[model samples]
Target: GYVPAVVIGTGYGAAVSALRLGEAGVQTLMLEMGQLWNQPGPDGNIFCGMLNPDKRSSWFKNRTEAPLGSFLWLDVVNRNIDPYAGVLDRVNYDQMSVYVGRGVGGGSLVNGGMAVEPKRSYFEEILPRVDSSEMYDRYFPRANSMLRVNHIDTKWFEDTEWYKFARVSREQAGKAGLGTVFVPNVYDFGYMQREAAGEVPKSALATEVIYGNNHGKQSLDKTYLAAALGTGKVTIQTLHQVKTIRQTKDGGYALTVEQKDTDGKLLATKEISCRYLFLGAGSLGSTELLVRARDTGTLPNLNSEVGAGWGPNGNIMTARANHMWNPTGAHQSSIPALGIDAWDNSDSSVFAEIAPMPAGLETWVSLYLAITKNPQRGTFVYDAATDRAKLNWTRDQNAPAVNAAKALFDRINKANGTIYRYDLFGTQLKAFADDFCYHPLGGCVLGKATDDYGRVAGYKNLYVTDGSLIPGSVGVDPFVTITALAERNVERIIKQDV
Candidate 1:
């Protein structure tokens, strides 16, 4: 018997897809290439939402064994865990570029839980020509509801110190004439229930969610994955990495997956067949898979435009303050309070909220680092022996966008604003030496691959519902949009694509 719907990666797209299919008795399976975060510490029960993976580092030994954190992309290409391991890419971008979560719920495990919905107009106009209306709207809201996307407007917003950080920025944003709003999040502090019940700690106080939050911040592992499990229609195989994917006589995907040591050493390999397949890997994960799928001729009929367009949205993380070196307060919660975006005026803009930390790392003072758009793009490739994906990016087309964002930065810089990233924050930014925000996107694109619904262009049953399907980065955040888009497609999938 074939798995009705098999989601390859447990990231946002994958978890959301599994939620839909699993809830509907579609019989889903979410396969993760990383380890689960729900582990115990030396104290027994591991604390949730701690915002640091320090204590849990040993717990991930089986997964992070390789230098996978810093040089992940290069590691994938050379079949090494992280090619830039031990050596820094001090070259161009920072591997500490994103909130990429692996294992059960994919990035949901590590994300800051910012569940923002883009302007409806943006969605309607910019979608890749490949997606369809009747297909997408169906799952969009469903995914949102399941993820519990909600504005943190409850008393929690007021009671928590983090809101002030956001509020501080909000005031400046209003002064700067930039629109700002309360960030929506999939995070349900109901775990705050556990906290109130003395089961856990609240995301209040000075909890900065940089490394890996310990307290419950409404990640997907507990949201959709929980719903997916409730349906009993899905089976999740954690710590499993798909190595090779091919088509079979039945027009389904023949998957070859392996279990590996954290050191990039092969532990074991297994084969599984999926009739209706989905690659829910993030933009990086999915694009890498599809490009390799096409190049290796695994799916010989793979569309010609398989690996054409991709990017990380030129994500730039910067900070602006009304007064330089002024503490909004020495000890505020680490999450962003207000979002400042010069996006509207730029060639295109990406809205980013200030994400301040409570403490400092090494030398920098306690400040904010956030997901700001850089107006650039990137690419990914596959390696045979290393069984990893290689990522490469260029920001030429995004020059204008970059300049615009920076020009806006300049306006604020005159008012005491500075970048938080490399070559930007110093006394003077080294122009033309910007880095990426690690929000990788597009490679088996919408129109190019399958039909508008993300069915692989050449395959009958293969489908894609990941960051790879998104064409370009929106001026604002991409997670809520991506998840909604995934949900939107799945509805059509059950209705038509199936």
Candidate 2:
């Protein structure tokens, strides 16, 4: 039952690593803490709709943990669900909560599908040791092709009913002297075009996102993971949460896992040993695993950098009340296709996405999710008392990014005579929701916690190839960068270490 390599989690890194390892003819086992998607429930729906989500929308919790706390100071946004593991995981810390996908496809199951590569200048600055030229020439395009990253047809994006909100937001950004740019996505633009023409069942065009895309979205399960399995050397075990990792007496790796059933009951404790280990459990998950192992003396030699350099990817969400003349449509697509590019501002580097407010009724609110270049980074520490990883981040630490976003929004508001939307994020007067983040990065950073090929600096045969490798920010959506970096690292590892 022993495999040559074990990949934990099935996100961008895990999927890519699994596929490549399998293709390399290494027997690989992938451990997933969540269920396999692409199966219909009792109601015959593969994914629960976001507007009327059930237990399948969240992990084994009693109530939902959506980032939007309220519409108008009412707790009605969340509803009770029976204990069942689901797609989304809301990991709560002291002052912040991180939203991550728990299913086999990982973040692709719940994310906005933005497949972005950071500017070459910013990317080179962040990881100077990395070969930016090779990335631009090779790995990035490889990742994009496999992920099916594509842009919306410009004509369709302008003419379709789904992008009405984007057009309106684009005009507002233009009026504010800002430029809007099309953001590439992993969602199939051809399928989207067909959906717009009434030739397919609605998905991105439907008011269904965040819960799961019924179709059109090229989630990893249908792409990388599928190819991994097709190689005949990769196998996946779901609902097996890795609790501890340690080296065996013979210098191999062993993982202790807590196997759970659909009802959330622990079925058994099992151990898997492997020659090579890949920690792709995401930023929070991978960092927590190492932090706990280091603190508990399970993996005593892990460096101090195992839990350092963590950040929220400078994520801040806020809504704007547009003028009566500018009407962001009620029939808006949930998938974001555009962003206001304001990163050139010397005061603060910020790229803000024009998020969809799909309420199914005209709200005339322009929502934005700003990814900023805040220098603040948080660290994770194992709390022995609570038996959990604690992030040392506070609301005050968010001031830099919040101020940067506010400065940009203030200019837009001033030019259009519009104001901030307060009712969407629960607080009455606050213009920014800085407490939650969908993009969590760092904690097991590259070149510090790991070698150039993502091999842990102090360990042999162990690797990290996820968002945990990012320093703090990528100045774009983290998935594509994460995928490309994994491609670069695993190829080097395969060529040398493996």
Candidate 3:
């Protein structure tokens, strides 16, 4: 099969690229490894709640892998399930494990919907070659508006029991002399208010996150991908995975794709050729393809920087045992609304999301997922035996992230007379979870492996439009940055190359 343009993955970047390409009147085909996830199951629900997940919770695993591994040192959070292609996948490396969404909408389907933009100074510091003024003035606002980013009603936030957890954390942060900021989200706050009022079926209030959100969230599938499909020029093929890439003699790119079923059975192998190729398969997926191609001599001219600039975005999860007097509420919203903004602290810069523990009962716990500034970077080495890219990051490299989180949480804990919760993460004495990450940024970084506009350095008409363009940390949730950058790059590419 041949296409004029081919995009791999339907995540934020790919969705943005496809929509723009379709708008430009270019015929585009998108290949995704996971299912579309639009069909309802026998239970009449598209997605199961986190409290009782089925095989739909995990990707081809024998059991569900929830981030909150346990409760009170007992392995009660995860459930044993049949192996199937699920929404969330935990890609495990030697010392690191990355949780990535596997469906058409990608990470947006399973994430907390925190649509945050990185700080201007941090953005300038990271991608200095790019025009920051244009991004802040134009692209950021464009991405926000298109993604339907919205703020919670302040009155509703203060009055609702769903946000009591956020209020509790805000008070704790205020007591420690740290300011809290209301983080904007892609989830429709109006729908959430209706859910709270019993006017609609509860999704966020019903513990329906991580596995998948049955409502509220403006995931790429419901936003960008839907628009792309509506354009009539874009077509998405789910359960189709691109295995290898090589340039044809006619100056086109040929991809070896494998078609699979939900049960992980290979149905067919296809040779798809295209004039223009876009890799939007997240950090791990995109980087592994390029690394495998280069190492296997398929794309021998590819530069050495293809798999060099990878990082885990300095993610660390920790929880605090609050005083019994201050309960975090029995009903907590799955979407995080507030954050501890200590990003100005030069010693240990951190922006921690006041996460929720929607256990349906008050446990007097305050959980947090902290984004710290860790300078450590990981490299991906291609392994010939498995035909995969292996990350060379170690658990010890996360010490900086742990220390940074500890610095901020310690102050809050001391001020509030609280202590770290050791039994939440499965390990007996573990207070901080440093082994896993939600945000995996960089691999084929901009101005390094790719040009300033995400054009591949050594290949014509080949582009990387994903989180892999960002060099490690974004100082906040990264989907907004990824969407804006993709918009910025595709606009340039359509004008110049298309």
Candidate 4:
């Protein structure tokens, strides 16, 4: 079968593209490798919260795997469950792992809902060729408005019991002579307020993050994709993975898709053709697909820059043990609403979010996921021997990132008279978990690898519209940036190419 435009993933990029193209009256088909997120499971919940995760948390894996490997070096964290097409996926490499969302909403389903814009200066520095003015003035505002990003009421933030952990971290940051900033999020603050008031079932307040949110999170499935389908010009096929793409001798592209069931059984293989192919399968997924096409000679015209300049977005995780007097509370909310921003400091590069433990116990620990300005970059190589793409991101390359974050947290520890929490991350002596990343960016990077508008250099009617376009770290949560960039690209592509 053929379509005018075929989007390869139903994420920020694909969702935005589908919505815009649908509104433009283009007949579009979106391919998703996961299930629709709107239905209630057998448990009568829309999603399985993180505290009591099940088979629905991982994609066809027998055991649930979380970023936190274990607690106190014990393997008690994970349990066996029947496999299903789950929402979260942890793509493992030799030395590191990358966590991404698998279902209809992509990372929006599993992320903390941090809708932050990069610092304008950092944005200009990162993607020098892309017009920062247009991004900040037009697309960022448009994306934020569409995503329904909002801030918590200052009074509610200070007074609510759900935000006690955030307030505690803020006090400690102030005590350490650092700055604390209220990070904006996509979770509806009014709904959160209602949850706190006991008028509704708790999601953000009840430690319902990372796994999935039962309510209040304006994920792409609920917002952009919802609107995209409403236009009547867009159709979505779930559990359809695009395996290969080739440009036809005459014109247009050929895509081989693998349709699978929830139990990981192959159902059917379908061949589809399209005039325009948009690769929005995310950083790793999209990059892998393109690299495979290039290496296998299916799309030989793809440039050598296809799999270069990949990065883990300078992600590093560390936890600090607070003083006995500074109890972090027994009941902790999973949503992170505040951050320690010391970006102005000339010595070290760090923007750390005070994360939640949410063990339903007062462990007296302060957790942080620091996004540093690490200059380290990795590459994805299509290993023909394994018939797969491998990311050459070593632990050694992550050292500079660890140094940058440690330089700031070391001071916080000294000022607060606290020490590192070595027991939380399954390591007896290691303080930082630099081997895993929740925010992976940059493969098939923009500007150097593609045109300024995400048009591939050697291809016509093809585009890269996901996080793979970002050169590297955005120094903030990246979903908003990805959405805005897609918005910018599609607007240009529709005006020019379409």
Winner by lDDT:
3
Clashes of each: 38, 0, 0, 0
Supply candidate 4's per-residue lDDT for 40. Answer: 88
Show where candidate 1 strays beyond 4 Å.
43-99, 128-140, 154-160, 189-200, 204-208, 261-265, 321-325, 341-350, 360-376, 382-388, 395-398, 415-433
Give model 1's TM-score versus the native structure.
0.80
- The reply for model 3, stretches above 4 Å from the true place, is 73-77, 345-347
Question: Which residue runs does candidate 2 get wrong by more than 4 Å?
Answer: 65-77, 345-347
Measured against the true structure, the TM-scores of the candidates, in listed sequence, are: 0.80, 0.97, 0.98, 0.97
lDDT of 2 by residue, 1-498 (tens): 467999999999999999999999999999999999868987677787656668998887788654362354224456898978888878789999899999898998989899998889899888999999999999999999999898888988899777888998888878889999999998888998888788999888876678789989999999999999999999999999999999889878999998998788999999899999999999998999989989999888989899999889899998888788878777878889999888863448789899986576777888899999888899998999988999999989999999999999998888888899876775467779999999999999999888877898778999998999999888888999999999998988888978
Candidate 4 C-alpha error for residue 429, in Å:
1.2
Every candidate's lDDT: 0.59, 0.87, 0.92, 0.87
Q: Candidate 4 — what's its lDDT?
A: 0.87
- Over 1-498, each residue of candidate 4 has an lDDT whose tens digit, in order, gives 899999999989889999999999889999999988878888888788766678888877788755462254223456898888999888889998899999898889989999999999989888888888899999999999999899989998898777777888888788889989999999998999999899988898776788789988889988999999999999999999999999988799999999999898999999999998898999998899989989999889889899988888888999888788878776666788899988852427789988876566677778899998878799999998987899988899999889999999999888888888876766467899989988889888998668998888789999999999987788888899999999999999999999
| Candidate 4 residue spans exceeding 4 A from truth | 66-77, 345-347
lDDT of 1 by residue, 1-498 (tens): 367678898877787788778777787877887766666655443432232323233233222221111121212222212321110111123232333655677666555677666555555555735344543465556666878876554576556544455666655555546666666665555554344345666453424243345565667777878877888888788767887788877677888888775444678888788778989977766777877876787877776667656665555545443454434544454444346654442354546656654432222222233333443445555666665556555446556545655565555444445433333333464333234444556776677665777888877778888878876565466777778778777777877755
Model 1, residue 215: distance off in Å is 1.9
